[PDB]
């Protein structure tokens, strides 16, 4: 039980306005045949064009919302909408393109999907709110067959070319005209009352309905992300490495240890309230401080209300010492905080568009994160870059230019000349810091934080 049986029933009520008279009793086997495709009893890696909700969740990076609206059905022009914001008009003879025949529309579809997906996934999952025209338009740009490999590399084939009779992945498909072995899921099969807009609008105010196919494609994918990653959460599902995951995670641990260690040295807080991940470990194990932990799983819907986290009767006195919120997203941080908050607006291959301003951050696991909100940080200031080290000035064991920097907080810099070891460590830390910031993380600190207080920790 890993793939969707072709003999599974498909509910057709949502299809009967575009396809009147459609049988109520329908399987995926009969639907695929009605769509103009032939599977030929093939056991070659592609058992069904449609996939289960569980398979869809494992391939969230491949999700492309897709809608087709009748502009005027073999006789009328169709408006093809994608969650990339693209609208294409196909004639049978928020970017809006004029009417063109299918032979050229299919080339644009292959280019668009290839550019969007090459750094995200090995496939495409068309996310539908199926009403009929989208399913019957697939024969004009989709070809199916056995699972294949790319003609220029070892990746699975996602595109086909009728000009060269060859197959390509998303990286090698320039000039290709057909999408090959795509996957799809109809959100209407999950059990909903009412139309797409009424279901989407219950959870999201950021996507509107400008009455165009791409608006529907965007709402469809947003609703699917809500159902799979907001109202339902699965942190056991592992996702492949596609970018700088390892370096980002290692950088985050390095920055956390640096910042908290320096805050404790600079202001000598007697207690630290560590709020967030129930599996957190002390990030500064040698610190003298009374370390207290408070469990809160990552919020995937709305940011936590600070009143619910702190009140309703623990140290109780969160106003004592300092509070550490390392990716624990709250509505308004208290003044005595050290904070790491993911900025959902960041553009990256790890950060996918989400629900209601939120984003789906996929790095080993998938985390839907509430929309970044500048007002959460009104009691704090942005944490400036700094490097601090009390380790001995000694090289041990990569060519060199002497480091001059006001933010290298070390004994050698206090003494007037940064040593080789601290220069190498400073440059490595700066790279880690820049990697974490560029990945979307933002750092905030209590207004009294001053690195000038670190210089007297060398006596
Ligand atoms: C395990 C240490 C700690 C710094 C708390 N991890 C993270 O917050 C984090 C975020 C990303 C992305 N990678 N790691
Ligand atoms: Zn390839
Ligand atoms: Zn939405
Ligand atoms: Zn040094």
């Amino acid at each position: 039980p890993t793939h969707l049986s072709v003999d599974t029933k498909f509910k057709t009520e949502g299809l009967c306005v575009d396809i009147p008279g459609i049988p109520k009793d329908m399987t995926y086997r009969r639907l695929i045949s009605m769509m103009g495709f032939k599977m030929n009893y093939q056991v070659n890696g592609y058992p069904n064009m449609f996939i289960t909700r569980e398979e869809a969740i494992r391939h969230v990076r491949a999700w492309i919302g897709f809608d087709v609206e009748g502009c005027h059905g073999t006789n009328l022009p169709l408006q093809l909408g994608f969650s990339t914001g693209v609208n294409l008009v196909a004639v049978p003879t928020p970017l809006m393109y004029k009417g063109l025949p299918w032979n050229v529309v299919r080339i644009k579809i292959v280019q668009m999907l290839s550019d969007t997906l090459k750094n995200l996934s090995d496939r495409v999952v068309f996310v539908l709110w199926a009403h009929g025209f989208e399913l019957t338009s697939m024969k004009y740009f989709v070809k199916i067959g056995p699972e294949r490999t790319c003609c220029l590399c070892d990746r699975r084939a996602t595109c086909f070319s009728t000009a060269s009779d060859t197959y390509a992945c998303w990286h090698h498909s320039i000039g290709f005209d057909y999408v090959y072995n795509p996957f799809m899921i109809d959100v209407q099969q999950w059990g909903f009352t009412g139309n797409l807009q009424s279901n989407h609008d219950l959870y999201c105010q950021v996507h509107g309905n400008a009455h165009v196919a791409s608006c529907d494609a965007i709402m469809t994918r947003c609703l699917a992300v809500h159902e799979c990653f907001v109202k339902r959460v699965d942190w056991t599902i592992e996702y492949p490495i596609i970018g700088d995951e390892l370096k980002i995670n290692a950088a985050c641990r390095k920055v956390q240890h640096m910042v908290v260690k320096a805050a404790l040295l600079a202001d000598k807080f007697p207690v630290l309230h560590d709020i967030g991940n129930p599996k957190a470990i002390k990030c500064v194990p040698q610190a003298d401080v009374e370390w207290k932990f408070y469990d809160a799983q990552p919020c995937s819907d709305k940011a936590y209300k600070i009143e619910e986290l702190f009140y309703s009767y623990h140290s109780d006195k969160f106003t004592d010492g300092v509070c550490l919120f390392w990716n624990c997203n709250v509505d308004r941080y208290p003044a005595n905080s050290i904070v790491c908050r993911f900025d959902t607006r960041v553009l990256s291959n790890l950060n996918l568009p989400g629900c209601d301003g939120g984003s789906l951050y996929v790095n080993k696991h998938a985390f839907h994160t509430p929309a970044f909100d500048k007002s959460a940080f009104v009691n704090l200031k942005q944490l400036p870059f700094f490097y601090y080290s009390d380790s001995p000035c000694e090289s041990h064991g990569i060519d060199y230019v002497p480091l001059k920097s006001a933010t290298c907080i070390t004994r050698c810099n206090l003494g007037g000349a940064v040593c080789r070891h601290h220069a190498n460590e400073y440059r490595l830390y700066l790279d880690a810091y820049n990697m974490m910031i560029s990945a979307g993380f933002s750092l905030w600190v209590y207004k009294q934080f001053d690195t000038y207080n670190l210089w007297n920790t060398f006596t």
Side-chain angles (χ1 to χ4, degrees), residues 1-71 73-74 76-313 316 318-397 399-459:
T2 193
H3 286 134
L4 178 62
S5 171
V6 294
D7 297 312
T8 303
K9 294 304 177 80
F10 176 93
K11 174 168 189 167
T12 58
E13 188 177 337
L15 262 43
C16 80
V17 163
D18 292 357
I19 316 173
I22 194 167
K24 179 188 180 179
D25 178 29
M26 171 69 49
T27 61
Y28 285 95
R29 185 187 301 271
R30 183 143 179 79
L31 188 66
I32 291 158
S33 178
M34 169 188 305
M35 291 162 62
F37 296 93
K38 196 165 186 186
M39 316 268 301
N40 291 124
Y41 312 96
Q42 166 251 109
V43 281
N44 284 143
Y46 191 73
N48 194 338
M49 299 179 65
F50 291 84
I51 64 173
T52 67
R53 199 165 164 163
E54 299 70 41
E55 198 174 327
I57 287 166
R58 286 188 289 115
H59 301 289
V60 73
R61 289 162 171 162
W63 292 9
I64 298 289
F66 176 55
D67 181 58
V68 170
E69 296 300 329
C71 264
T74 325
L76 49 93
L78 297 163
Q79 179 187 63
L80 271 50
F82 303 89
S83 60
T84 61
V86 171
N87 292 278
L88 302 176
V89 178
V91 304
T93 197
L95 278 312
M96 317 289 290
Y97 296 88
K98 285 179 66 174
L100 283 170
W102 275 114
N103 48 302
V104 307
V105 161
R106 68 176 61 114
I107 301 164
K108 174 60 179 180
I109 295 176
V110 170
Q111 172 269 305
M112 179 202 64
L113 291 180
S114 298
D115 290 340
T116 304
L117 298 172
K118 58 194 188 193
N119 303 310
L120 295 187
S121 169
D122 63 348
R123 68 196 65 207
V124 61
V125 174
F126 289 130
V127 185
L128 321 168
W129 184 271
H131 54 262
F133 291 146
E134 71 293 283
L135 291 181
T136 65
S137 79
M138 277 170 191
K139 70 176 84 78
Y140 302 113
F141 67 99
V142 168
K143 283 291 179 54
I144 76 166
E147 282 284 274
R148 288 172 184 268
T149 74
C150 178
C151 67
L152 291 162
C153 82
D154 293 313
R155 300 174 181 101
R156 86 180 269 277
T158 59
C159 314
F160 168 74
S161 178
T162 58
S164 59
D165 203 2
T166 63
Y167 297 87
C169 73
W170 304 128
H171 299 273
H172 300 117
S173 67
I174 193 162
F176 280 50
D177 59 337
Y178 280 85
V179 175
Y180 183 76
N181 280 11
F183 304 91
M184 54 206 73
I185 190 165
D186 176 25
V187 174
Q188 296 220 245
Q189 301 300 311
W190 304 353
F192 286 99
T193 283
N195 69 10
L196 167 68
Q197 190 182 4
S198 70
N199 284 287
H200 165 274
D201 289 1
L202 284 178
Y203 314 120
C204 174
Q205 328 305 324
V206 154
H207 299 121
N209 189 13
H211 304 93
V212 326
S214 66
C215 299
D216 296 321
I218 293 176
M219 287 198 285
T220 297
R221 185 188 162 283
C222 175
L223 180 56
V225 175
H226 185 268
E227 299 303 284
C228 303
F229 300 91
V230 176
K231 70 160 286 187
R232 174 249 301 272
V233 180
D234 200 341
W235 305 303
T236 69
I237 301 167
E238 204 83 28
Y239 291 87
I241 302 303
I242 63 168
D244 293 321
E245 285 98 321
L246 303 186
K247 273 178 204 308
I248 292 163
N249 301 346
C252 286
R253 294 189 283 271
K254 246 253 270 263
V255 176
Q256 183 188 43
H257 171 79
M258 180 72 71
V259 168
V260 175
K261 172 177 171 147
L264 294 167
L265 284 172
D267 296 86
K268 311 182 166 62
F269 297 107
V271 56
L272 179 147
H273 310 270
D274 201 341
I275 305 131
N277 202 273
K279 298 311 297 174
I281 269 287
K282 278 201 214 182
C283 60
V284 187
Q286 308 299 314
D288 210 336
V289 75
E290 176 164 17
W291 209 289
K292 304 188 189 200
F293 291 99
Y294 305 83
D295 304 347
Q297 293 289 8
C299 53
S300 61
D301 192 341
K302 285 287 105 236
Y304 286 118
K305 293 177 197 172
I306 196 67
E307 334 292 345
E308 65 186 347
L309 287 181
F310 285 2
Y311 307 116
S312 310
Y313 213 38
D316 278 329
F318 290 97
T319 60
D320 281 343
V322 70
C323 294
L324 173 64
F325 300 85
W326 200 270
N327 296 314
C328 179
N329 304 330
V330 323
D331 64 346
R332 181 140 299 181
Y333 298 97
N336 60 333
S337 306
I338 297 166
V339 175
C340 177
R341 215 287 190 188
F342 187 69
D343 187 348
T344 58
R345 309 166 299 170
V346 71
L347 269 91
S348 83
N349 300 138
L350 304 181
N351 201 37
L352 305 176
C355 185
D356 202 28
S359 76
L360 187 63
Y361 180 66
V362 191
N363 180 326
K364 303 175 75 62
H365 307 286
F367 304 98
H368 191 273
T369 306
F372 183 85
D373 173 12
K374 295 169 176 181
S375 70
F377 317 103
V378 295
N379 302 320
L380 309 173
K381 67 181 177 187
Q382 301 175 334
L383 171 71
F385 169 80
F386 73 91
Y387 166 75
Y388 174 83
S389 183
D390 54 358
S391 76
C393 295
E394 240 293 276
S395 269
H396 290 287
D399 277 278
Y400 188 72
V401 166
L403 180 66
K404 297 188 197 310
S405 176
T407 59
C408 181
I409 312 171
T410 64
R411 240 180 318 258
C412 48
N413 203 19
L414 179 68
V418 179
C419 79
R420 193 161 301 176
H421 169 69
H422 283 126
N424 293 341
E425 287 299 307
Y426 172 104
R427 292 168 170 135
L428 287 169
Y429 183 72
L430 181 49
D431 286 346
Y433 198 84
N434 285 332
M435 167 81 57
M436 173 186 182
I437 296 302
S438 70
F441 295 95
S442 67
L443 296 162
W444 309 77
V445 74
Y446 52 96
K447 283 180 180 184
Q448 310 91 339
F449 180 77
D450 188 356
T451 65
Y452 194 61
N453 298 141
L454 298 167
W455 298 105
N456 281 123
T457 72
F458 310 127
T459 45

